[PDB]
Amino acid sequence: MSEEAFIYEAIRTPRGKQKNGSLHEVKPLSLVVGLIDELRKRHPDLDENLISDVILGCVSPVGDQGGDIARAAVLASGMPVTSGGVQLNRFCASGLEAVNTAAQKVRSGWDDLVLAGGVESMSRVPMGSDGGAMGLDPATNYDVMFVPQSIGADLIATIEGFSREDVDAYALRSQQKAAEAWSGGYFAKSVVPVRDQNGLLILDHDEHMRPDTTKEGLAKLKPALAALGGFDDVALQKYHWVEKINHVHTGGNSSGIVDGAALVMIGSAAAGKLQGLTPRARIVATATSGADPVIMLTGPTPATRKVLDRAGLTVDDIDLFELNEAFASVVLKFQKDLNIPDEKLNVNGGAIAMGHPLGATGAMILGTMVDELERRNARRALITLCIGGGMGVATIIERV
Amino acid sequence: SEEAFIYEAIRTPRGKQKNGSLHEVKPLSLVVGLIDELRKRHPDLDENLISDVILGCVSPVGDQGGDIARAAVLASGMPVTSGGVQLNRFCASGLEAVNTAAQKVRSGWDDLVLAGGVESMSRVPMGSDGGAMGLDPATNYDVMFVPQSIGADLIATIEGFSREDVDAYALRSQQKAAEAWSGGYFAKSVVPVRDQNGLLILDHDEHMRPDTTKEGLAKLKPAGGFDDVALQKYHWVEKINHVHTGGNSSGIVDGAALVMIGSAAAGKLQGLTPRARIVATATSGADPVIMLTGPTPATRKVLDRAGLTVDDIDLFELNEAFASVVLKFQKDLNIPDEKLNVNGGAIAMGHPLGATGAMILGTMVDELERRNARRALITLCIGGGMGVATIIERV
Amino acid sequence: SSHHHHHHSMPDNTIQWDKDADGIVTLTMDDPSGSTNVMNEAYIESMGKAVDRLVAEKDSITGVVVASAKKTFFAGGDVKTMIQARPEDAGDVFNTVETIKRQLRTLETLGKPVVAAINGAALGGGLEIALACHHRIAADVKGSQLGLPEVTLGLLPGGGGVTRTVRMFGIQNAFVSVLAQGTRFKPAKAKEIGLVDELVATVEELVPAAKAWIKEELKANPDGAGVQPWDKKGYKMPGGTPSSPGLAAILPSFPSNLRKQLKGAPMPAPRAILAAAVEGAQVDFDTASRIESRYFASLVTGQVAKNMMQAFFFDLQAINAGGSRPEGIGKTPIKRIGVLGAGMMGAGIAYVSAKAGYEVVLKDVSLEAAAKGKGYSEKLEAKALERGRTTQERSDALLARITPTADAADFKGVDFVIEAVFENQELKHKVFGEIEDIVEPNAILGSNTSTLPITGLATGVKRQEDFIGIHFFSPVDKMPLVEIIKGEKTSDEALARVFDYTLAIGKTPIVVNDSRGFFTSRVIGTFVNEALAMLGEGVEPASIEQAGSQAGYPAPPLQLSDELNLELMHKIAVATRKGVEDAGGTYQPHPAEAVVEKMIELGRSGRLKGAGFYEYADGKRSGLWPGLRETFKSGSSQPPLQDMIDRMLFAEALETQKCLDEGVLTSTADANIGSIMGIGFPPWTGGSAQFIVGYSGPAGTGKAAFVARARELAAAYGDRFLPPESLLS
Ligand SMILES: Oc1ccc(/C=C/c2cc(O)cc(O)c2)cc1
Ligand SMILES: Oc1ccc(/C=C/c2cc(O)cc(O)c2)cc1
């Protein structure tokens, strides 16, 4: 609780779509090595031996993402072999948990300069490829009342009273703000185009964005593992006061299945000054809590409220709110509960437009707020992600 | 600022690979059984104060996939606010979880954290998750991937450790592990595994061969062109002396371990007694073609970070992945022979990858209290050229 | 390691040994302790000696044939022993099934072909013995059945049934089709699904055809002789293993689909069968078998298994053995039956009476309606022709015995009357007066009544000795209970005639003394009234329905109230208030009566009116009435769900104890089976009377815990939950 943790770099790859994606031919290890090579290009005189660890979030650490992909990144990129490399899985907020763990390692004073981020090539390693106890253990599945994300989001919209037009209204809002951010050049210096072993361009934009989205086209989409029956009954067996679940979530108001990776360089003030690094933002506080595991998606609210209380701040003190756009109802509930002003919530669009690379999303939307706090010349931003099982993770950053 | 303390440190018995007693037990059940034992020792523990559960797991696939730490929180009925995160740092996943838990407590943003690991290698063999360094010819052909067993034989070749030398340490590990069990050293920490009816499944480390003799170790045989690959980097070595067998290498077993770590105020708020204090942690490494060399620079890093030397440490606990690794480590730092792995190691009791770091960590917590000794240093040779080290102090 | 029960007077011997000149041993099971080979201590020792002898003489043995000398092959086990298994006896239970499977596993891996000669019923451990063989031949004989129905008793196939069926059909097919519901199969159906390989016309061909298969298998396939598919190098589980990408995509939906089918009821047996199946498919056959033993031991030592074994075994045995029938009465068949009325009840009684081989006359007010009463049988026969259960030759015989008419003279020559026109005493008195003389002189005069006392209805006929209540349930083709109501003037002979008539039409009878509400209607009334009271108290209607479903009921209570018509419930309350204010006492109205009258005032009296607690469109429930929450301010009272669930179960359980105290019922077997099969009391309880002695909650178990929980509900919801003195010390 002594050393302050500072963000020095926060970059990410463009998010390639699932069907006919440009990044499908790129091994997820190469997505991380490309970002490491970009950090070297920006800081050629950085003694990489001072980097004590590389922490990558990955929700499906199997196949191309198995065998500690963080360690493979350290070895393949020619980094100093003493730089460690660890993979962690906290589902959706694995990317931010990696950043938070790196910040906490610097705070303890026992690590000095840490790389953090995530990687998720969902077109190559689909969600669920790793299996899991909940699934291969019917005794556990039957007890915990396992319910997928999409059903919990429909349940949130049913309880809170979010109509099908309400969620599609936010879905259009995300597509519009994401297109305005790209046209304004906001992502020009943080989205690092992916190239092959010859330097040829593979992808330079978030190809999942449908910027010509209209209200009428969103209404023609039909609601979407969850197709296999029983999950509605299991959900309503716990939430017995709810009679019918209004399935409002489609592929146009839910987070997109994409490939991508992100890297955040975190270290102490002494480490940055020794390497000639300008601190961009400061990690003010982090928090971890959760909520019910049958509704699952709700859970960011205690994490946001605890990180605000931990930093001694209120909602009014935060300039920008960045919540992962897993489902429109989750963001609408989060906005409704905390009375978040609309002009401060996901000001550059979210996962509905640009995609949700599970293990890498937490670091992507974190680095998004570092760039937007500077571009707006604002002070504080709060970044949070819901997680399956009800276990949110929130983080407050301050521009420096 | 805040100091991290160890309040509990338990582990399951290690069940062997072939015809193992724990083969029918899901690795999730191994963690839940340890959570229930923590409840038995502190039934009035406010579980809402537990902010995270950090489990190490090297092969998080099948029964161990889907964030097994989160599955343990839900299946055991723990509060849903208690988090749950799986991490994989090869052989150090057990100790990295403990270290991360201590670093989260030091930062002041977590109050009470559970840490440990789980590895059911009989159900999920290592390598079941795949990987790039093995299943990607571009990066495999570049980083010179060599199995850790060949690196251990290469260590014995360079340092001049004979087949008798590594087998001598193997017999020593069997003797000390058997002496610790009969002496009751593991009575409180090894939590027997039972089924859903309460019937006994396993109450001891069944991989141990306590009647080991040096003549029997010599009758063992040493277990894709990796020899040529290793010598291409260590070009001054003509031929590798393959001295490691199944008798002088770590056993493939199933097991799990749990450690409860929190701040001084957290334990005082919940009526807990500190058993030991986490003093320092460190991470470094060396050449990944020889792999198991991270412990030596990481041990020096944790000694300098705590302002201590070898003469200040009472007990040294290095994971017995291979006999040559421990002998190489003992010669480098001039470790006294009566201080090194005093209660036996993985050669006798087994090496359940993701859980070993937390097992040998809790093993030293008990031995410090049993001897009324002060300090102990715990290190594991991570796979791929890394190393973790942790210094604990008795309270 | 041993094939025997203990390593350190002895049991009997139930297996005969015979080795032919070819080296084929024929194990003939013939337990001298009964007419059926069961899996008791005598069998385990007998098979233990025989399996030992197969190994000792393995040089002079080329094949094995497992046959039976009973009418059945092998059926069931020792329920008298399993129902006594305490939780402390989990070690003995685990060791017993491990010994049982150790014998079959040695028989299965003998290096020689083993053929099962299934001459009759092979249920439970019987089919498990056959599954251990390499070839199964069944004699296509009448009455033969094959299946693993231990889930119906709260158990699971612990003798390898779970492990082997999953090895044969995969996780999904073995669970859904065989294990989850304990489905029984005729021999022809068994061969189709893979439970049986061959069929023979008569039982005398079994042992010869078995030895013929051994000889051909030894010559045609000498390498893989006596080797199961899961003991070969390249075995591939059908549908894949839990690690297969195709099965791992649908595997997480199996527990949710099961939790959907059971509606959240606390029935642990199907949950354990699925766990043992999936966990077993991840390991070798022997490790899978041991996991099967542990899940079996967790069920036998549990309470639900004891509730179901008490109800569906012991309680059903006593009823079917004439427990409530008078002791010394003779039997007299009936020629023709007369069903008065062609409603959903009268038409239903006409179908089940004809399907057992009895001529029926269906008299109604008009021939237009009597024809549509017989149409109930036509629409159930057309549903049996497209599905293929009955043939065309058989279906014509059923509908022929139904003679729909509107003339009262067609009842000439009827020795069994079953009236079902309407709940009105002066109507039944008039309807019976029009028919009591045209029928036979010694005819049974039955009446399908729900509440009107039989003694009062008998004052409208002459020979009251043959007047009795025969209460059926809608729909009659499905509901298996017949509530025989003994009027004050009914003779003991009339009880037996209706008793044997109930067994002749394939239904389960209970004998009930005359009382307002009898047993079924009176107890089920406390069930719907407790839910209506909850609605008036402000509890969410969706929670009330979920509470009824998670309790184990087949239909939620508000849904059932619409089908029972709230006008009838108001009608009963007026009658109950009439029998109290006239006897000299003050009436204590049930709090649900205020909700009944409110729904009547709003014109929503039930599904009959087309509007009740649910809305109706196209003749089907269209959801809960949106105005229902506004009418009763739903949500203002949010009790825990377990409090709602217990309030319904305890109301019926306490009302059943009153019926046993007043003399309405004479045995707990009638109370349990009558509540289960009559009003749909959840089977996991084992009956409304078993629910008391077998209660299990957070406070404890047993009758003492039931009283404590009843007093807990009484102090927080009303004095109606106070237990009678019969349950108090
Ligand atoms: O309604 C009923 C429900 C269940 C049963 C039990 C049937 C049965 C018969 C056997 O030979 C073995 C067995 O394990 C079960 C009977 C009637
Ligand atoms: O399908 C099956 C169903 C039940 C059983 C158990 C039989 C049994 C017999 C005993 O004498 C004692 C006992 O504890 C159990 C075996 C197979």
Residue numbers in the entry:
A (entry chain D): 1 to 224, 228 to 403
B (entry chain C): 2 to 224, 232 to 403
C (entry chain A): -13 to -6, 0 to 720
Question: What did the study's authors say about this model?
Answer:
The Mycobacterium tuberculosis trifunctional enzyme (MtTFE) is an α2β2 tetrameric enzyme in which the α-chain harbors the 2E-enoyl-CoA hydratase (ECH) and 3S-hydroxyacyl-CoA dehydrogenase (HAD) active sites, and the β-chain provides the 3-ketoacyl-CoA thiolase (KAT) active site. Linear, medium-chain and long-chain 2E-enoyl-CoA molecules are the preferred substrates of MtTFE. The Mtb genome encodes an unusually large set of enzymes of the β-oxidation cycle; however, only a single trifunctional enzyme (MtTFE) that catalyzes three of the last four reactions in the β-oxidation cycle is present in Mtb, in contrast to other bacteria such as Escherichia coli, which has two TFEs. Here, 226 fragments were screened in a crystallographic fragment-binding study of MtTFE crystals, resulting in the structures of 16 MtTFE–fragment complexes.
Furthermore, near the CoA-C(ECH/HAD) site, fragments B-H11 and M-72 bind at subsite I1, which perfectly bridges the gap between the bound CoA at the ECH active site and the CoA-C(ECH/HAD) binding site.
